[PDB]
Design an enzyme around this catalytic site. Structure first.
Site, PDB file in Angstrom:
ATOM      1  N   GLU A  33       0.810  -1.212   0.000  1.00 18.11           N
ATOM      2  CA  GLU A  33       0.000   0.000   0.000  1.00 18.11           C
ATOM      3  C   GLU A  33       0.848   1.270   0.000  1.00 18.11           C
ATOM      4  OE1 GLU A  33      -3.914  -0.441   2.303  1.00 18.11           O
ATOM      5  OE2 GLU A  33      -2.530  -1.673   3.481  1.00 18.11           O
ATOM      6  N   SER A  60      -6.527  -1.979   1.252  1.00 13.09           N
ATOM      7  CA  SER A  60      -6.816  -1.396  -0.063  1.00 13.09           C
ATOM      8  C   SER A  60      -7.334  -2.432  -1.057  1.00 13.09           C
ATOM      9  CB  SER A  60      -5.592  -0.675  -0.639  1.00 13.09           C
ATOM     10  OG  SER A  60      -5.163   0.375   0.212  1.00 13.09           O
ATOM     11  N   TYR A  96      -9.166   4.049  -5.799  1.00 11.00           N
ATOM     12  CA  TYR A  96      -8.168   5.068  -6.091  1.00 11.00           C
ATOM     13  C   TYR A  96      -8.028   5.436  -7.561  1.00 11.00           C
ATOM     14  CZ  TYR A  96      -6.837   3.500  -1.423  1.00 11.00           C
ATOM     15  OH  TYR A  96      -6.852   3.144  -0.093  1.00 11.00           O
ATOM     16  N   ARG A 139     -11.353   3.438  11.168  1.00  5.80           N
ATOM     17  CA  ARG A 139     -12.444   3.343  10.202  1.00  5.80           C
ATOM     18  C   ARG A 139     -12.861   1.885  10.072  1.00  5.80           C
ATOM     19  NH1 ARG A 139     -10.551   3.377   5.433  1.00  5.80           N
ATOM     20  NH2 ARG A 139     -11.852   1.558   4.934  1.00  5.80           N
ATOM     21  N   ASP A 174     -15.298  -1.072   8.352  1.00  2.00           N
ATOM     22  CA  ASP A 174     -16.040  -1.427   7.150  1.00  2.00           C
ATOM     23  C   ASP A 174     -17.117  -2.446   7.504  1.00  2.00           C
ATOM     24  OD1 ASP A 174     -14.118   0.192   5.971  1.00  2.00           O
ATOM     25  OD2 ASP A 174     -12.921  -1.507   5.244  1.00  2.00           O
ATOM     26  N   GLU A 205     -13.821  -5.337   8.945  1.00  2.00           N
ATOM     27  CA  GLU A 205     -12.476  -5.028   9.405  1.00  2.00           C
ATOM     28  C   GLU A 205     -12.481  -3.656  10.060  1.00  2.00           C
ATOM     29  OE1 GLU A 205      -9.302  -4.044   7.029  1.00  2.00           O
ATOM     30  OE2 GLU A 205     -10.365  -2.599   5.755  1.00  2.00           O
ATOM     31  N   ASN A 246      -9.511  -0.426  10.296  1.00  2.00           N
ATOM     32  CA  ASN A 246      -8.207   0.093   9.904  1.00  2.00           C
ATOM     33  C   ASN A 246      -7.749   1.148  10.906  1.00  2.00           C
ATOM     34  OD1 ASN A 246      -8.275  -1.195   6.995  1.00  2.00           O
ATOM     35  ND2 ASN A 246     -10.207  -0.077   7.255  1.00  2.00           N
ATOM     36  N   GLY A 291      -6.878   5.793   5.283  1.00  2.00           N
ATOM     37  CA  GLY A 291      -6.368   6.608   4.198  1.00  2.00           C
ATOM     38  C   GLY A 291      -6.739   8.068   4.368  1.00  2.00           C
TER      39      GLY A 291
HETATM   40  N1  LIG Z   1     -18.064 -10.535   3.375  1.00  2.00           N
HETATM   41  C1  LIG Z   1     -18.144  -9.595   2.407  1.00  2.00           C
HETATM   42  N2  LIG Z   1     -19.289  -9.391   1.719  1.00  2.00           N
HETATM   43  C2  LIG Z   1     -19.376  -8.456   0.754  1.00  2.00           C
HETATM   44  N3  LIG Z   1     -18.355  -7.658   0.392  1.00  2.00           N
HETATM   45  C3  LIG Z   1     -17.148  -7.754   1.001  1.00  2.00           C
HETATM   46  C4  LIG Z   1     -16.975  -8.753   2.068  1.00  2.00           C
HETATM   47  N4  LIG Z   1     -15.707  -8.643   2.498  1.00  2.00           N
HETATM   48  C5  LIG Z   1     -15.118  -7.659   1.772  1.00  2.00           C
HETATM   49  N5  LIG Z   1     -15.975  -7.126   0.881  1.00  2.00           N
HETATM   50  C6  LIG Z   1     -15.659  -6.035  -0.075  1.00  2.00           C
HETATM   51  O1  LIG Z   1     -14.236  -5.920  -0.201  1.00  2.00           O
HETATM   52  C7  LIG Z   1     -13.793  -4.642   0.266  1.00  2.00           C
HETATM   53  C8  LIG Z   1     -12.513  -4.752   1.078  1.00  2.00           C
HETATM   54  O2  LIG Z   1     -12.666  -5.685   2.144  1.00  2.00           O
HETATM   55  P1  LIG Z   1     -11.910  -5.407   3.537  1.00  2.00           P
HETATM   56  O3  LIG Z   1     -12.231  -6.554   4.469  1.00  2.00           O
HETATM   57  O4  LIG Z   1     -12.246  -3.985   3.919  1.00  2.00           O
HETATM   58  O5  LIG Z   1     -10.364  -5.506   3.061  1.00  2.00           O
HETATM   59  P2  LIG Z   1      -9.313  -4.274   2.978  1.00  2.00           P
HETATM   60  O6  LIG Z   1      -8.608  -4.221   4.315  1.00  2.00           O
HETATM   61  O7  LIG Z   1      -8.382  -4.701   1.871  1.00  2.00           O
HETATM   62  O8  LIG Z   1     -10.112  -3.030   2.654  1.00  2.00           O
HETATM   63  C9  LIG Z   1     -14.927  -4.086   1.105  1.00  2.00           C
HETATM   64  O9  LIG Z   1     -14.944  -2.656   1.028  1.00  2.00           O
HETATM   65  C10 LIG Z   1     -16.157  -4.718   0.489  1.00  2.00           C
HETATM   66  O10 LIG Z   1     -16.622  -3.911  -0.598  1.00  2.00           O
HETATM   67  N1  LIG Z   2      -5.800   0.123   4.481  1.00  2.00           N
HETATM   68  C1  LIG Z   2      -6.447   1.056   3.501  1.00  2.00           C
HETATM   69  C2  LIG Z   2      -5.391   2.131   2.992  1.00  2.00           C
HETATM   70  O1  LIG Z   2      -5.898   3.476   3.563  1.00  2.00           O
HETATM   71  N2  LIG Z   2      -7.183   3.225   3.932  1.00  2.00           N
HETATM   72  C3  LIG Z   2      -7.420   1.780   4.094  1.00  2.00           C
HETATM   73  O2  LIG Z   2      -8.735   1.304   4.164  1.00  2.00           O
HETATM   74  P1  LIG Z   2      -9.070  -0.173   3.507  1.00  2.00           P
HETATM   75  O3  LIG Z   2      -8.784  -0.150   2.027  1.00  2.00           O
HETATM   76  O4  LIG Z   2      -8.203  -1.225   4.156  1.00  2.00           O
HETATM   77  O5  LIG Z   2     -10.526  -0.514   3.735  1.00  2.00           O
HETATM   78 MG   LIG Z   3      -8.215  -2.504   5.506  1.00  2.00          MG
HETATM   79 MG   LIG Z   4     -11.324  -2.201   3.963  1.00  2.00          MG
END
Ligand SMILES: Nc1ncnc2c1ncn2[C@@H]1O[C@H](COP(=O)(O)OP(=O)(O)O)[C@@H](O)[C@H]1O
Ligand SMILES: N[C@@H]1CON=C1OP(=O)(O)O
Ligand SMILES: [Mg+2]
Ligand SMILES: [Mg+2]
Ligand SMILES: Nc1ncnc2c1ncn2[C@@H]1O[C@H](COP(=O)(O)OP(=O)(O)O)[C@@H](O)[C@H]1O
Ligand SMILES: N[C@@H]1CON=C1OP(=O)(O)O
Ligand SMILES: [Mg+2]
Ligand SMILES: [Mg+2]
Lengths: 315, 313
Positions: free
Chosen positions: B28, B156, B222, B261, B263, B276, B278, B282
């Site tokens: 990243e 990311s 991005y 943040r 998700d 997750e 973070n 970002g």
């Molecule tokens: N269980 C899930 N169901 C639906 N979409 C998902 C799921 N897990 C991840 N995603 C999609 O993938 C993206 C990134 O997943 P995440 O767990 O946030 O990994 P990262 O740390 O790389 O952002 C999320 O923003 C979502 O759009």
């Molecule tokens: N780890 C990334 C890079 O900056 N922001 C983050 O959010 P994410 O993409 O993991 O959901």
């Molecule tokens: Mg992340």
């Molecule tokens: Mg994420």
């Protein structure tokens, strides 16, 4: 399982380890213990012919790391600033491979409260407890847990800041004394019975050691100053019991992510049940120390023990 | 309370010399370069005595050269939000922003984070750990399809893929294993996506995310121009409060400090699913914490100062 052969691996070539820095000392309450552990490790590694030198970890540490060439770091620091993941993260950012548990495992196992919390969520046995932050928390804990109790700081070692208490007044005092070392203070129910410690090395559980002291518990004086402390190897446990204790140690360490080596402290009560106290991720290496003693029982001298720890850092 | 977020931000000179740590060696790094540039520029404009450090093999030499009263960590991924940089700063005696060593290492590990959430009864998608083709087959039988595969310690959306069959499951596992031997796979949640920023212990307004892509992948984060951002999200008061409160429990379960943040997915029946958290979100112009901070009133300068003010504890 205890396999003496595979315990020694990168052991035969002390030159292949590169220039090894032994990290000891520090600014924690266990500094004096760390100094003796470092002098022992550095002397044995030198006698083994490894390119070893010592670093008393102080305010000039980052300067020391850029000046000296370092291929491996043997962490033998005790307490916060060494076992809590901070030194581990530094060495990872410095690109220096190191011995022992990783960042997350080290930080978790330093935190007795968080370690116990992980253990409980997996059905592993550990004494009932309370978090102490006020006199009211002491009154609540004394009401719910009875007496005697054991007060300890959450992030300490070598029994520092600890006290066995038999009354509420002794409890409040012991809470205020532990709070001088750590704002996180926990109190446990007193387990009455044999005390055992279980070293682990490169994934293998070593022979258990039984501990005894005329003192109220295995305190600082009993560990490094007294002479009437009793160490029993083999521990008097039968086969099925020592296997039960060994399998329990492996589950408790695996649950924290322990890597390379470590030492578990376990009590047993009048009904034979085991209770996990703590896990140390950079155990002592002095003369009085227990991981060397359990290593001798396994069949390794103090020189093969450090080389096995060093050789494990290669992965 | 917007008065509480702005406490300790009135005097930019009270922070001393502030080092913005960005770049790094993780996958990243490019995102962190954009994030560092934004944080640095904002701080300088606010009157903070700020300078940047591109974290590389140079790190320890720079830290013995530069005078630093405080570090603003805006690294992304391993080596930055995994507690390693936090641990170095504590050894160096430099106070820093964001979560501590334990919380960062925990939040970086999606598997242990999910296990911490499950142990407290917080919702998070059912999953499997993938280390072999047999693991893929077991997961396909138990979990069904579609699924989403991700490395344990990435961000990311790097190394991720939604898969609709067993053949692409195994292909996604091998691609994700190029970034991390720890690989998981989750049941795909079909429904609205949200992200929920937290700042100084306060939950900021939630954002609704959409993209033409199959999921919110790296390109949709991005590069693409048609990613959709909804603040306010179309949730009612009771449901957004529910979302904010679940975020608070999910962050406090990890020890998150300063900011972060989360998700969150929402299934077809309204139930929320945690993905997750973070610990160094970002801060690029495509980033979501600045967007949620603006929804709570704060501009970019107040957000970085609020983060910096919180680290003074
Ligand atoms: N269980 C899930 N169901 C639906 N979409 C998902 C799921 N897990 C991840 N995603 C999609 O993938 C993206 C990134 O997943 P995440 O767990 O946030 O990994 P990262 O740390 O790389 O952002 C999320 O923003 C979502 O759009
Ligand atoms: N780890 C990334 C890079 O900056 N922001 C983050 O959010 P994410 O993409 O993991 O959901
Ligand atoms: Mg992340
Ligand atoms: Mg994420
Ligand atoms: N719940 C308990 N019951 C009985 N003895 C205890 C208990 N907790 C601690 N002790 C005694 O205190 C000693 C030190 O406690 P421990 O939890 O190992 O932390 P540390 O050694 O890091 O200070 C143990 O060796 C044990 O003898
Ligand atoms: N932390 C000490 C120092 O070396 N060995 C350790 O284990 P402990 O005394 O905490 O049981
Ligand atoms: Mg200890
Ligand atoms: Mg102990």
């Amino acid at each position: 399982n205890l396999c003496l052969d595979s315990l020694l691996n990168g052991t035969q070539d002390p030159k292949a380890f590169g220039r090894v820095a032994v990290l000891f000392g520090g600014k924690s309450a266990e500094r004096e213990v760390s100094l003796k552990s470092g002098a022992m490790v550095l002397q044995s590694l030198l006698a083994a012919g490894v390119d070893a030198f010592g670093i008393d970890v102080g305010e000039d540490l980052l300067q020391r790391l850029v000046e000296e060439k370092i291929d491996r770091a043997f962490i033998i620091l005790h307490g916060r600033g060494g076992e809590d993941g901070s030194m581990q993260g530094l060495l990872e950012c410095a690109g220096i491979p190191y011995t022992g548990s990783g960042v997350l495992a080290s930080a978790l196992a330093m935190d007795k409260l968080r370690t116990k919390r992980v253990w409980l969520s997996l059905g592993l046995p550990t004494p009932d407890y309370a978090v102490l932050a006020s006199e009211d928390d002491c009154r609540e804990a004394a009401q719910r847990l009875g007496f005697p109790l054991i007060v300890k700081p959450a992030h300490e070692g070598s029994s520092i800041g600890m006290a066995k208490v038999g009354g509420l007044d002794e409890l409040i005092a012991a809470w205020r004394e532990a709070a001088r070392y750590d704002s996180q203070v926990l109190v446990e129910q007193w387990i009455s019975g044999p005390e055992f410690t279980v070293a682990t090395l490169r994934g293998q559980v070593l022979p258990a050691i039984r501990l005894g002291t005329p003192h109220t518990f295995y305190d600082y004086d009993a560990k490094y100053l007294a002479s009437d402390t009793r160490y029993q190897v083999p521990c008097g446990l039968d086969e099925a019991k020592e296997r039960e204790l060994k399998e329990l140690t492996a589950r408790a360490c695996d649950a924290l992510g322990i890597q390379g080596w470590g030492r578990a402290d376990v009590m047993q009560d009048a009904e034979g049940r085991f209770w996990l106290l703590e896990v140390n991720t950079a155990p002592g290496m002095t003369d009085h120390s227990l991981v060397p003693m359990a290593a001798r029982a396994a069949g390794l001298d103090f020189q093969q023990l450090v080389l096995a720890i060093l050789a494990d850092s290669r992965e």
